[PDB]
Symmetry: C3
Amino acid sequence: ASLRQQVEALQGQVQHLQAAFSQYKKVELFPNGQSVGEKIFKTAGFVKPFTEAQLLCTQAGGQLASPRSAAENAALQQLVVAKNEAAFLSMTDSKTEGKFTYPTGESLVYSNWAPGEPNDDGGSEDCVEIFTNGKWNDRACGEKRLVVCEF
Amino acid sequence: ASLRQQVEALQGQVQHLQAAFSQYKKVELFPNGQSVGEKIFKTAGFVKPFTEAQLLCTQAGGQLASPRSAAENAALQQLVVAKNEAAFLSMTDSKTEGKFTYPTGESLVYSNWAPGEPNDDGGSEDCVEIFTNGKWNDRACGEKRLVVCEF
Amino acid sequence: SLRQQVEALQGQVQHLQAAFSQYKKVELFPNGQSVGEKIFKTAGFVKPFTEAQLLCTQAGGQLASPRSAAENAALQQLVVAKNEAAFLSMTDSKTEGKFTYPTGESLVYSNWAPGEPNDDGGSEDCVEIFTNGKWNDRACGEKRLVVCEF
Ligand SMILES: OC[C@H]1O[C@H](O[C@H]2[C@@H](O)[C@H](O)[C@@H](CO)O[C@@H]2O)[C@@H](O)[C@@H](O)[C@@H]1O
Ligand SMILES: OC[C@H]1O[C@H](O[C@H]2[C@@H](O)[C@H](O)[C@@H](CO)O[C@@H]2O)[C@@H](O)[C@@H](O)[C@@H]1O
Ligand SMILES: OC[C@H]1O[C@H](O[C@H]2[C@@H](O)[C@H](O)[C@@H](CO)O[C@@H]2O)[C@@H](O)[C@@H](O)[C@@H]1O
Ligand SMILES: [Ca+2]
Ligand SMILES: [Ca+2]
Ligand SMILES: [Ca+2]
Ligand SMILES: [Ca+2]
Ligand SMILES: [Ca+2]
Ligand SMILES: [Ca+2]
Ligand SMILES: [Ca+2]
Ligand SMILES: [Ca+2]
Ligand SMILES: [Ca+2]
């Protein structure tokens, strides 16, 4: 009977919440975040070696930036450009040299290697950095790079 | 019948979100945000020339700080004071000298000019900065000022 | 038709719950910590006690006030991450030797380093927490990491 009115009432609160949430999300991502589809990149704004970077992201309930399409890569590139610091991706070929995988162990479904890469320089480049131009380069995991997590 | 129970269950989930979100709004706005009415100012925490500052805000889905009332201007001032750095506003008289407009092209509905301003010093001041005392001054767009966006 | 509107409302709420949960993770990284119903967040810079206290209150919160081992460990994470000791909210400004919260009540938990509090130089009324989580009374005029709780 009057249930129709409890429906409309709830409709109002939900919609006011949707509106405030949309506003607060835009505010949240400025200036250190970028959303693309259902994924959100956020940079910590400082550099760390791979192991440390990876730990910061996992402990925060996410993982290191893992661009899976050209659209995701471009979104990530924006933060790298904004900070003017190359960043680590999540992917490594530590298990089997030459075969880059995501943290889950799955093979890459997208790549944006710079010309000549990956080249395993010095016989010891198992992590991946993304440059300000959005291209990728395998690099030693001990180097320090911008920390960007995805959620 | 069962529809009544469903609506009641949603009401409880909504209440939970509302309370939880209320807390996160405060957390998020600390220390670089300022809420006033339905507007939110947030500083990027660094300085840029007007053109770069404007692009940052627009690409983030907002625009440069545009106080439209004394209340908004006072809220913006609080951030500026806290960061101890003058900030750009969105408004310019780049189109017609002496006529300041918002990015939308509409004339100012509020202003807080320091005495004697705007004065187009050197014949080349088309942007606007807000001081820590909350007053406005027209200024060369090439200068670097604190980036504060509104959402 | 009411049952169809309820279904749409159900969808909206499930979507909001999922988005809010994702958003919380984003907000807390890298400067916040959630413990129980409390959230610590660092401003990422240092200030003297009075200015730090003002920043927190103006933002609708207060300075870090760990009231249990669990809260202290969470706060400790931010301190370690920034590698900067932080001010707590508590002081014995009113009565030497009796530390109190901003409300005025006495401490209900403490984690003092060995030998502390010692009012060194006869003038230490504020509290700092080290990277090791232990507390030391310290001069309020020193500059320490600002960490608020909400
Ligand atoms: O240091 C490992 C790195 O060396 C080479 O790249 C270097 C240089 O040639 C490049 O111009 C700059 C800018 O990209 O980076 C390094 O200084 C390459 O062999 C590269 O594959 C390798 O990872
Ligand atoms: O330099 C442009 C600026 O010059 C004059 O303002 C001076 C001073 O009075 C102001 O407080 C500071 C603020 O940064 O700038 C100058 O030092 C005025 O002519 C002013 O209108 C003008 O924009
Ligand atoms: O007066 C400041 C402070 O001095 C002493 O503590 C110092 C040092 O002894 C400790 O190793 C480190 C711990 O990280 O803290 C200070 O640097 C103590 O006398 C202490 O009570 C006092 O507040
Ligand atoms: Ca290898
Ligand atoms: Ca390799
Ligand atoms: Ca390489
Ligand atoms: Ca002009
Ligand atoms: Ca002018
Ligand atoms: Ca001027
Ligand atoms: Ca004393
Ligand atoms: Ca004392
Ligand atoms: Ca002491």
